[PDB]
């Protein structure tokens, strides 16, 4: 089996762990870097509370589709939680980290048409690197989760430092 | 999600398709070859009919574990059918084909001891190559399935020609 979240169509949490650990095993064999991004969408709770779960869902579908479109089909974009997304970028380079983040930040920031309204979410991104930040997905996700929370705290759209 | 067959512990048919199509997308991005092997184990029907499904199961567990230790953890070994196994070898080379097949053939051929009885299965392997034999997993599997059946029909324990 290999399940997808039906609303967003993105791989789910369980498939992300399985697929993710497979990408790290392959990158160890190939000598390639892997970056793990943790994306939190800020204005989400406000959407569902004001407009309802259905409006929040349309914000996710649209935001999910947009993000897929802007990263390689060979990369993994997963719905981790209710409004949390995890991204696995295979064969990534540290030099172009900042440039790839502005591509993903500009996508997530795009407003979404909901029942005539144009609603917007604000992203906060935590970045973890393989092999620098860990040996397995679990360790990279805890580090990317931690850094995503440092970014939200510094009111900066991303945090990637050791 | 991403399911495994509980008896053999190997990825199941559905996970093989999902993971397999992900490896082909990545190999298209990386310029690397992928070989798809289709392995049929003859003698299997004879084991279960003579000794029972429990003896047949022990022949699979053992044969699955043996194959799993003789290929890279980054490669996919899946239980396709009752006694059919599919193998996805990432970054494989046409020149080493014959040598790798003799490694897998020698493993599968090893007898399984269960209640003293020496129980042996005989493999027949069909080989398909990416990008020569197809664009997606489905096409490569139909070609390797076809060639596994041509190998069975012949003296040779493998068939890989166009
Ligand atoms: N700046 C930048 N953007 C990136 C990079 N990697 C992916 N993207 C973005 O992610 C989109 C989807 O990539 P894809 O599914 O790999 O699908 C790609 C891929 O299969 C192929 N392609 C384009 N350029 C290359 C390339 O330089 N190398 C390889 N291997 N394939 C490429 O054509 C498809 C369409 O590409 P786009 O329309 O441009 O759309 C791309 C592009 O917006 C990158 O390394 N740098
Ligand atoms: N996993 C992953 N890594 C990414 C992605 N985007 C950028 N990178 C990483 O950053 C490196 C350089 O990105 P760039 O400056 O956009 O420089 C890129 C860009 O100028 C171009 N390019 C490559 N792929 C595409 C593409 O699919 N679409 C477009 N439009 N341009 C591409 O070729 C250059 C070199 O490609 P690489 O050697 O692969 O080297 C890439 C890759 O290691 C991504 O969406 N996913
Ligand atoms: N002749 C041959 N046999 C192959 C080849 N690839 C895999 N194998 C076989 O598959 C077993 C498991 O490989 P692994 O999971 O990648 O796990 C490997 C891998 O993580 C590492 N390793 C060994 N040699 C290499 C290597 O040359 N390059 C890389 N990247 N890792 C290696 O040590 C682990 C255990 O390897 P072994 O005990 O040798 O056991 C190997 C070996 O019997 C190959 O290209 N040629
Ligand atoms: N997916 C996959 N492909 C395989 C496997 N076995 C061989 N190949 C492919 O065939 C090439 C040559 O294998 P080799 O002559 O045994 O020559 C190998 C072997 O002598 C050695 N080596 C590589 N991996 C291992 C290993 O895991 N264990 C041991 N003991 N030796 C290894 O390094 C040599 C060249 O390495 P590569 O560039 O990897 O080049 C490998 C690889 O492209 C496999 O189990 N899985």
What residues of A are designated binding site for 3',3'-c-di-GMP? 29, 70, 72-73, 75, 90-91, 96, 103
- Structure determined via: X-ray
Cα–Cα dist A97/A35, whole Å: 9
Cα–Cα dist A145/A140, whole Å: 8
Q: Which residues pair with B88 in a beta bridge?
A: B36, B76
Taking a C-beta distance cutoff of 8 angstroms, is the pair B94, B129 a contact? yes
Among all chains, which residue has been given the structure tokens 């935590």? A126
Cα–Cα dist A16/B103, whole Å: 32
Q: Mutate one of A2, A28, A77 to test the B interface: name it (highest B CB count within 10 A).
A: A2
| Beta-carbon contacts of residue B119 (< 8 Å; ≥ 6 apart) | B43, B47, B51, B55, B59, B111, B112, B113
Cα–Cα dist B117/B98, whole Å: 31
Taking a C-beta distance cutoff of 8 angstroms, is the pair B35, B97 a contact? yes
Using omega within 30 degrees of 0 as the cis cutoff, is the peptide bond preceding A44 cis?
no
Q: Is B47 exposed, middle or buried (0-12, 13-18, 19+ CB in 10 A)?
A: buried
Q: What is the resolution of this structure in A?
A: 2.3
CA–centroid distance for A53 within its chain: 21
Question: Using a CB-CB distance cutoff of 8 angstroms, which residues of chain B are in contact with residue A14?
Answer: 1-2
Which pairs with CB-CB distance under 8 Å and at least 24 residues apart come from A62-68? A62/A112, A62/A113, A63/A107, A63/A108, A63/A112, A63/A121, A64/A8, A64/A9, A64/A10, A65/A8, A65/A9, A66/A107, A66/A108, A66/A110, A67/A104, A67/A107, A67/A108, A68/A10
Smallest CA–CA distance from A12 into chain B, residue: B1
Among all chains, which residue has been given the structure tokens 């949390």? A84
Taking a C-beta distance cutoff of 8 angstroms, is the pair B79, B63 a contact? no
Token couple for B72:
């890279």
DSSP state of A31: T
Of B153, B23, B45, B158, the closest CA to residue B91 belongs to B23
Cα–Cα dist A44/A22, whole Å: 31
Cα–Cα dist B123/B83, whole Å: 10
Of A46, A50, A83, A48, the closest CA to residue A67 belongs to A83
Cα–Cα dist A26/B73, whole Å: 8
Token couple for A79:
């719905």
What residues of B are designated binding site for 3',3'-c-di-GMP? 29, 70, 72-73, 75, 90-91, 96, 103
Which pairs with CB-CB distance under 8 Å and at least 24 residues apart come from A128-133? A128/A35, A128/A36, A128/A37, A128/A38, A129/A33, A129/A34, A129/A35, A129/A36, A129/A92, A129/A94, A129/A160, A130/A24, A130/A27, A130/A33, A130/A34, A130/A35, A130/A36, A131/A28, A131/A33, A132/A162, A133/A36, A133/A162
Smallest CA–CA distance from B3 into chain A, residue: A1
Of B23, A150, B7, the closest CA to residue A158 belongs to A150
Cα–Cα dist A105/A156, whole Å: 11
Among A27, A73, A89, A104, name the best residue to mutate to test ligand 2's pocket (greatest count of ligand atoms within 8 A of Cβ). A89
| Beta-carbon contacts of residue B161 (< 8 Å; ≥ 6 apart) | B147
| Beta-carbon contacts of residue B101 (< 8 Å; ≥ 6 apart) | B37, B125, B127, B158, B160
Nearest-Cα distance to chain A for B15, in Å, is: 4
Residues of B annotated as catalytic are 83
Q: What is the pairing mode between strands B122-130 and B158-159?
A: parallel
Q: Report CB contact under 8 Å: B19, A19.
A: yes
Token couple for A15:
């498939």
Q: Is B89 in the pocket of ligand 4 (CB under 6 A)?
A: yes
Contact map slice: B 40-99 vs A, CB within 8 A: 72-74, 90-91
The yes/no answer on whether domain B1-162 falls in CATH 3.30.420.130 is: no
Taking a C-beta distance cutoff of 8 angstroms, is the pair B126, B159 a contact? yes
Type and span of the H or E element at A106: helix A97-109
| Beta-carbon contacts of residue B45 (< 8 Å; ≥ 6 apart) | B83
Among A26, A29, A32, name the best residue to mutate to test ligand 3's pocket (greatest count of ligand atoms within 8 A of Cβ). A29
Residues of A annotated as catalytic are 83
| Beta-carbon contacts of residue B44 (< 8 Å; ≥ 6 apart) | B56, B59, B82, B83, B121
Cα–Cα dist B66/B108, whole Å: 8
Taking a C-beta distance cutoff of 8 angstroms, is the pair A66, A107 a contact? yes
Contact map slice: B 102-161 vs A, CB within 8 A: none
CA–centroid distance for A91 within its chain: 17
């Amino acid at each position: 089996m290999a399940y997808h979240d039906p609303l967003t169509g993105l791989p789910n949490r369980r498939y992300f762990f399985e697929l993710g650990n497979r990408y790290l095993d392959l990158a160890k064999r190939e000598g390639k870097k892997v970056f793990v991004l943790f994306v939190d969408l800020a204005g989400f709770k406000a959407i569902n509370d004001t407009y309802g779960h259905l409006s929040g869902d349309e914000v996710l579908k649209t935001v999910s589709k947009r993000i897929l479109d802007r990263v390689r089909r060979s990369d993994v974009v997963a719905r981790y939680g209710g409004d949390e997304f995890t991204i696995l970028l295979y064969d990534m380079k540290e030099e172009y980290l900042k440039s790839l983040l502005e591509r993903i930040l500009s996508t997530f920031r795009e407003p979404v048409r909901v029942e005539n309204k144009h609603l917007s979410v604000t992203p906060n991104i935590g970045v973890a690197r393989f092999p620098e930040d860990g040996e397995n997905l679990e360790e990279l996700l805890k580090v990317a989760d931690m850094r995503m929370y440092k970014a939200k705290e510094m009111k900066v759209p991303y945090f990637s430092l050791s």
